[PDB]
Design a protein around this ligand. Structure first.
Ligand code: HEM
Ligand code: HEM
Ligand code: HEM
Ligand code: HEM
Lengths: 141, 146, 141, 146
């Protein structure tokens, strides 16, 4: 359950990220691939090397999904429904992996947001990404 | 866990710049704020009611300093983490019964603290090297459960 | 997301359990204490030995909460709200521990429901207990 | 992992009654049904569209038999699970990249299968002994990640 303060904090952080969101999404993915190599197996058709257009493209989409969630934070199950279907039914993404990308998203924000990444905002962002992850893993059948 | 020479270089180079009087306190405090169930183990620390109270709590800072001292000791013995953490494993597992998932969480919090402190210098390969380290420390600290 | 078939399966299983629910709750707790000794630290004021009146009493309450969830399966966040407050705020129960008790509840049902514990019903029950666990861990702050 | 003589007794006594041609298939099938992301690794097995298709799938039964064979091998070497599972660790970790959480899940599924098969005989202490075993096998199978 995201509190009013959590929603404030998350909106504030993503505001600062501003138009770098796409680039940061790509960076978080790269961090995940390097830190947690088991995650790479979902992307056999990707070149995952640094500067990859495919990782960049996906990073933009990931950022777009997260922004959609922020923008509709009280309706996240609905907002992310199609994405939850994709990740569970078609992609068969192990639920563990959401915690890995979530961590890498936090790290990326921390590396780019010196002023904003306070302990409180850190906590709010973690709750937000946990909420997103919960929706994205809600559709296994 | 097996760090390559390049990974060892990345880790030791960054660590030399860490303020060891602060970073441990920062990581422990954020653990208590972000994963509030962990406060269960620190009832004697007093005021943990708000993020500011946690972060400014002198016992949090003091204890964090000890935690970081143990990470430093692991960094100096990357090829014998089990032995290095043996007595701490008995304490955290046999005596405290902390679920070992929380060892992973603290390690990941430390990684976030390093990213915040070092910014662009905390590159994706540098992080990957650090993830090997904190995974190793967590696994060693959890040995008594295994 | 519990499907219509999941809800059917769960209602069917708990119907068979019938009035043994309280006893089974106590058994699941005992299984947890023996299998996962870290869980025992939440109960320093309990005698956890076999036949303990305190474990029996708690088992009845646990069963009652689960039955309440089954009975209001489309409104579980509301139904279990007070319990989620208790387990997060007051008890500071590590979220990992919900997976442990959930497993022990499944084992207990399996040990008592030869006909009902089919792979499909097993899957439905796992989803149900995961849903309960999700609500019970939604209130950390 | 350290089993007491009473725990070893509990485990071996029950295991002697296990149908080793079926139970592995039953556990693997339930893994695929209950945790459907695991189906990702078994695309070549064919029809996994329904629980009945999974459970009746001859390749699921055949493969489960192999899995159970490995559990049996661990039961015969409880004090050297690492060595016993070394080549399987390389396969599951280095080659397949299965997340080790799934090793824990399969172990817990096996426990549910044993409970279903043995009923009241699968007592809480018997389960506790088996949890030590499956945790040990999971940790050994995951050694290449450590
Ligand atoms: C915050 C968590 C996540 C978000 C917001 C997210 C979002 C997205 C989005 C928006 C797409 C593009 C969908 C489309 O093109 O129609 C996508 C694709 C994909 N995602 Fe995720 N995802 C997340 C976590 C993960 C994780 C943890 C994994 C696996 C480790 C994963 C694996 C994939 C794969 C394999 C694709 C397909 C890429 C392709 O073939 O083009 N996702 N995701
Ligand atoms: C990598 C993870 C961790 C490391 C390296 C670590 C390290 C340490 C160190 C060096 C001490 C001081 C022991 C002494 O006084 O000799 C300590 C004590 C303690 N730790 Fe940790 N720790 C970790 C994780 C945790 C976690 C996650 C918790 C709880 C959530 C925890 C709870 C405690 C408690 C309650 C004490 C005080 C024990 C006592 O004085 O009796 N630790 N730890
Ligand atoms: C399906 C999951 C769970 C359910 C449905 C559940 C339900 C309940 C209920 C109904 C109560 C009684 C509340 C009252 O008396 O007002 C309770 C108390 C309690 N629960 Fe849980 N619980 C669950 C999981 C857990 C877990 C995993 C733990 C820790 C390992 C835990 C620890 C406790 C503790 C320490 C109490 C207080 C007992 C006392 O002091 O009397 N619960 N729970
Ligand atoms: C305790 C846990 C497990 C044990 C003891 C186990 C054991 C085995 C055994 C004995 C084999 C046969 C290897 C051979 O042909 O020599 C095998 C193969 C295989 N396992 Fe597992 N396994 C476990 C968990 C898992 C899980 C959780 C997955 C995926 C979710 C998985 C995926 C596979 C795959 C895809 C193969 C075929 C590899 C190949 O033939 O190339 N295993 N495993």
């Amino acid at each position: 359950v995201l509190s009013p303060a959590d929603k404030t904090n998350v909106k504030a952080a993503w505001g600062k990220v501003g138009a770098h969101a796409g680039e940061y999404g790509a960076e978080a993915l790269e961090r995940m691939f390097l830190s947690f190599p088991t995650t790479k197996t979902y992307f056999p058709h990707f070149d995952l090397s640094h500067g990859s257009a495919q990782v960049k493209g996906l990073g933009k989409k990931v950022a777009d999904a997260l922004t959609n969630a922020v923008a509709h934070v009280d309706d996240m199950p609905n907002a992310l429904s199609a994405l939850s279907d994709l990740h569970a039914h078609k992609l068969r993404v192990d639920p563990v992996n959401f915690k890995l990308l979530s961590h890498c998203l936090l790290v990326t924000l921390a590396a780019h947001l010196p002023a904003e990444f306070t302990p409180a905002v850190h906590a709010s962002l973690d709750k937000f990404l946990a909420s997103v992850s919960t929706v994205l893993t809600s559709k296994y059948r | 866990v097996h760090l390559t020479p390049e990974e060892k270089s990345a880790v030791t180079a960054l660590w030399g710049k860490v303020n060891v009087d602060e970073v441990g306190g920062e990581a422990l405090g954020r653990l208590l704020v972000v994963y509030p169930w962990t406060q269960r183990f620190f009832e004697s620390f007093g005021d943990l009611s708000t993020p500011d109270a946690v972060m400014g709590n002198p016992k949090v800072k003091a204890h964090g300093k000890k935690v970081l001292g143990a990470f430093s000791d692991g960094l100096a013995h990357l090829d014998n983490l089990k032995g290095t953490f043996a007595t701490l494993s008995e304490l955290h597992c046999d005596k405290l019964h902390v679920d070992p998932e929380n060892f992973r969480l603290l390690g990941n919090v430390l990684v976030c603290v390093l990213a915040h402190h070092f910014g662009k210098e905390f590159t994706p390969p540098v992080q990957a090297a650090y993830q090997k380290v904190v995974a190793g420390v967590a696994n060693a600290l959890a040995h008594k459960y295994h």
